[PDB]
Design a protein around this nucleic acid. Sequence first.
RNA 1: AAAUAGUACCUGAAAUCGUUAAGAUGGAACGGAUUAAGAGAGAAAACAAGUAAAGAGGGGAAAUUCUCUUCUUUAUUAAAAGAAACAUCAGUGAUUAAUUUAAUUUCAAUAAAGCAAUCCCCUGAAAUUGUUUUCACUUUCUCCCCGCACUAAUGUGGGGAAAACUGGCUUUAUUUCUUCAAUUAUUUUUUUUGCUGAGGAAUUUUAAAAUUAUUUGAAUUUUUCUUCUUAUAAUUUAAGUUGUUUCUAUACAGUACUUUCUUAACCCACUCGUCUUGAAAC
RNA 2: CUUGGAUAAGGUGCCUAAAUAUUCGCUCAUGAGAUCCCAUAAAAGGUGUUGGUUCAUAUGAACUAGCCCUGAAAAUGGAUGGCGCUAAAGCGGAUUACCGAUACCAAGCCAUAAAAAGAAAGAAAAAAUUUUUUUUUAGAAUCUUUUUAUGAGUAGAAAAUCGUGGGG
RNA 3: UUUUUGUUACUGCUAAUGUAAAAGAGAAAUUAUAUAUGUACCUGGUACAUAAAUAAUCCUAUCAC
Lengths: 201, 86, 64, 207, 105, 125
Amino acid sequence: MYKKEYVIDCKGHLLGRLASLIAKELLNGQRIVAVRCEDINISGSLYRNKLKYQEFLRLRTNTNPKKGPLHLREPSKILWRCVRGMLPHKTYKGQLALKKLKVCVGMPYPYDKKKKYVLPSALRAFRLKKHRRYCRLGTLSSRVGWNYDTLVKKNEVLRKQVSKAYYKKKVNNLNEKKEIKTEALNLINPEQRQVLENFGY
Amino acid sequence: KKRLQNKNSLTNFAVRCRLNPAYKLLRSLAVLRMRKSILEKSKNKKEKRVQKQIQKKELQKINHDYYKGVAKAVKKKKKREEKKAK
Amino acid sequence: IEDMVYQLYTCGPVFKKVNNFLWAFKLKPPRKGFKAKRHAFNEPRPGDWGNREAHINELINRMI
Amino acid sequence: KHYNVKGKKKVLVPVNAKKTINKKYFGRKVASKKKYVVQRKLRKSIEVGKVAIILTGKHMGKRCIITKILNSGLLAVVGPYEINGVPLKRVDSRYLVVTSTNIFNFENIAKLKDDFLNYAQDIDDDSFIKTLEIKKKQKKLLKFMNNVIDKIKEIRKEDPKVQKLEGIQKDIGSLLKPEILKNKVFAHYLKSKFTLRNDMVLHKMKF
Amino acid sequence: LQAVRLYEKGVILGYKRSQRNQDPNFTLISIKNVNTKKHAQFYVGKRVAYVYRTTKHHDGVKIKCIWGKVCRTHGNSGVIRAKFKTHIPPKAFGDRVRILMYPSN
Amino acid sequence: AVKKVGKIIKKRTKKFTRFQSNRFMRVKPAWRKPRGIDCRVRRRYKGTNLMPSIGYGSNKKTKFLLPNNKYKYVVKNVKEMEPLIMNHTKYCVQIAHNVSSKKRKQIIERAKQMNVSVINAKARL
RNA sequence: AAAUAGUACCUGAAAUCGUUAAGAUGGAACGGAUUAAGAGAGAAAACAAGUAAAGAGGGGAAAUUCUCUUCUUUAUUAAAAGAAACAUCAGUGAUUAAUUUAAUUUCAAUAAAGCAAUCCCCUGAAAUUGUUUUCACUUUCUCCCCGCACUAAUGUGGGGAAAACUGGCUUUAUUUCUUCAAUUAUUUUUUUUGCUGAGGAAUUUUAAAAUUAUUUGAAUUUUUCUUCUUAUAAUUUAAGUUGUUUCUAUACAGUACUUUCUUAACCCACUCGUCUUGAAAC
RNA sequence: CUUGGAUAAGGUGCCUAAAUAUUCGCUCAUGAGAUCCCAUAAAAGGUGUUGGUUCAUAUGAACUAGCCCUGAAAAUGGAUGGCGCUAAAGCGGAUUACCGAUACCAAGCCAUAAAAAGAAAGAAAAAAUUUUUUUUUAGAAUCUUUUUAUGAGUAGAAAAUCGUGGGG
RNA sequence: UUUUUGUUACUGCUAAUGUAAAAGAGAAAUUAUAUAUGUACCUGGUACAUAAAUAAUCCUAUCAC
Ligand SMILES: [Mg+2]
Ligand SMILES: [Mg+2]
Ligand SMILES: [Mg+2]
Ligand SMILES: [Mg+2]
Ligand SMILES: [Mg+2]
Ligand SMILES: [Mg+2]
Ligand SMILES: [Mg+2]
Ligand SMILES: [Mg+2]
Ligand SMILES: [Mg+2]
Ligand SMILES: [Mg+2]
Ligand SMILES: [Mg+2]
Ligand SMILES: [Mg+2]
Ligand SMILES: [Mg+2]
Ligand SMILES: [Mg+2]
Ligand SMILES: [Mg+2]
Ligand SMILES: [Mg+2]
Ligand SMILES: [Mg+2]
Ligand SMILES: [Mg+2]
Ligand SMILES: [Mg+2]
Ligand SMILES: [Mg+2]
Ligand SMILES: [Mg+2]
Ligand SMILES: [Mg+2]
């Protein structure tokens, strides 16, 4: 929390645990960008969570539905709303905290070339026993009218191909630098080599 | 009289000896026997094992018998009840 | 002061006078809290209000 | 002088009483009634030849060598001006971090402790306070913003305490420079300053 | 490559409070690498500086500082309670402070 | 809050303003004690006006001293300031509001010769 | 004399409106606590007595002698105060590392020598406490037979043997190879640190107590803190804070210090008066 | 009226100061559950799952009680306080640390109540060189020093104090 | 659409500043969780290799003139 910006990919994280750890960071003052929000997980059966969204859909201002609850249904706006409900967003400071969060579906440019972090205290693999039921956020949001699940998958395929080529070139570079390093160790005075060996560098 | 600071009667040596005219002697004697015993590491503490051999053998049989008897009584009560329950 | 310590620790012939000579002691709260002043010491729960025979020393060393 | 209560042996040094106050119902008197005071008892890592790091002044970051304990608590250091740029200087021991490395542990240098200690005797505590007349001379110059600076630097150079202290500084540097330069890595260590880098946490470090 | 650091970084949280009451005499600080109660005790005497900027000149300069002290810990996670000479304004609650290392031991 | 300069301590500096005097202009700011059922200031609700009490009183040793660290005495002519020649270190003088300039010049000139300070020796110049 | 005293004519408040300037402004506005950022004012504590040479005045005493003071320059000189840092002491807390002597069925290890094999310190099952007698109670990385690779197992299922490596007990001298725990009772110390400093004793801040260095004698615990004010001096641990440097500053109101307004933040805040068991009240 | 320390009731996933603490069990709900007052649920059922008792040669039964489920239908759109939570952030225990009052403890100050005393009086310091210069040199009885404990208030009662037109 | 110095007689003015966050604010495979990734060959399979308290780590920084 002493950095200009943290990039998280939300693939495989539970919605509530992740949203509770983002909100405290934002309140302490830290820009956060969250990507791949369509891969978020929730901890019930898919039917059960669809029932909950159906209940959320049927509450509206009786006299004029233009007001009242707005039923956002993109998978990233849902994380945005769940985070908003863990903040005091009706004060000036708590409204400043909310504006420091950026959410995306997929992985657009500025961030496909950055470093992504995870939060093990919220990973599904570590928190949920293996005979329990769970669902995927993209499937649920497509069931209630989102319509872009296929396109982001098609885009992610190409992104992963480009990343694979990058990784190949990088591994070649590290090997070619390691050989140079191991050759240059014999050209140094023995005292520097001994002190480097003692501390394992 | 005007009131002054109330001094800590335990950790302030002058007032502690003011209230108790015997504390100096007691503290000095305690310090003396403290220094004696710590100076006797690896010179004494060697026979204290000998007195262990002296009196723990004396008390061991009595203690062993007492606890043996308590345990046997508890067991006899168990068997006496189990026989009755049939 | 040692004379009245003696007369208090053992019920000496002068106990009524020595005890009545002192102001009532005013003490701090304990340093690690109570358990539950609602319930008794001898109850199978956390509680405080019974007669705790020799464990009073530990408590009143934490509020002295 | 000393007093000994419960086996502690606190040391006593004389102290003067200065401030005056009002009496209750006739003329005034001095407040303090004490005549001695307890000394300071510096911490058990300040020795004569150890290296240290200045933390506060114009020379923050720079390394130096302890030289003397100055009878008023604080202490004098040189990081030899010939090697470092740090002159004879008086510092509070509470603004220093002291390492575990000693000059007089190198066998190349350990033979010169006595000639170092003979020079350090003349280092004095009164020689560091500038007299009133020098203050008056410098402060008259405020009545072009570049001539005043060197004019101030020139009034300082003619204070006999400054000249006396500079002589000892030169003698120490001349004695101790040639042997230090023989240890290449150590001289480089003395010529550089200390900084904090991330991935070192300051409550697991040792230095 | 210049301007050495010689301090650890910190962030000023709010006041010492409960739910619904404030008590602005003390303030809460977070230190960068410290996240246990026992490691926070290491810093319990150091001086704290809060540096900020203004828009007018005040004594020839546009920077001023408020000085404080590290007094105690705040429980199980490495937060500390600090006391300043004046009260910190509430418009500072995510800003930066310097936990110095002057009173060296 | 508390203000302290030397040995003089003031426990509070803000005034006590009358309840509801910010909302109605027929109500003047001078303090009046609230009487009447359902007041919320008489009953000490949190978040409203405070009441004055004897607790805020000042130290008896420093109760009427000015920042000058002296007491104030108001004079109307040259002869009224005769007693100040014996206690010229504990008192300072102030000139009354309805004395003419000619009288003020004389008063100031005598106060200087007595080594007593004048608080307002710049009026009507 | 004065017309912002022009006849609706002394003074000329509040409600209400105009002009200019400076701010604020997502379905009320004001307010309490606490600070910050701006703007306007300010020297009576928020530095310098005095000395020396003039220049201009104003008094007192014995129209000539001495003496006292206020202003203006010029050049010389101290003192005092507030704040910060460091240190010393005292009062009240946090934090870490130990310790004397006892009690209360504790243990564990290193040499050698031995005792018993379903056997041992124990535990179990049968034949009011004490006693006696039977049968069970170990697995090994060994062997044999059957299944012949059968197992989750770099092995395994069923049935038989042996051994005392392992486990238990006994003699002895060991305890820095290693152990000497835990809980109470009773004593003595230590690392790093937060907050506070009321008072000012013309004769109780004294007496006493403690300390240190010379002494006059006796003990015992036999000693560089061993006791008993059985003689003089000093000191504080007694008898509620003292010191050293720096800054403000070689200033005369400056962007610094004091103060009053304005506008933000964080926490909090229903409309008064009245009758009523009960009022923010539809 | 304040400064500092440590608590009670209750809490420690975010809103919100302090445990995504440790150590044992139970529970899956196509209308789960979430602790005084307190903001509803029954008779009768279950071949859900977990413990226990009693009978019959390694199966068959009969009972018992914990969580879960059926029984369970109303009118604007809505409420374990909200988000949410299933290696719990749920239910029944245990072991520690921590956060938290105008209540508790140590210190200062204001007022109220009581108390110990007082109606005979004399030189202290600093700055300058063994003479000058500053500050003080007290004695008002409903008064002056010093000490301890205490402080909620409608109807109602009393004392002290502040201001206005006239008179001596 | 380079750089240097600055934003310390009057009519509203006619020269003109801000910051919710600099002090190394360093860090681009993918996938699974009763397992993974890379290479080679067949048409997912076979063989070999490599990680497995993996940020509890790598990189970067003082040598002036
Ligand atoms: Mg605690
Ligand atoms: Mg509790
Ligand atoms: Mg009750
Ligand atoms: Mg006032
Ligand atoms: Mg009422
Ligand atoms: Mg006229
Ligand atoms: Mg007239
Ligand atoms: Mg609108
Ligand atoms: Mg044998
Ligand atoms: Mg709020
Ligand atoms: Mg509210
Ligand atoms: Mg009534
Ligand atoms: Mg009615
Ligand atoms: Mg009402
Ligand atoms: Mg109603
Ligand atoms: Mg408090
Ligand atoms: Mg929190
Ligand atoms: Mg049947
Ligand atoms: Mg709740
Ligand atoms: Mg909760
Ligand atoms: Mg009352
Ligand atoms: Mg009338």
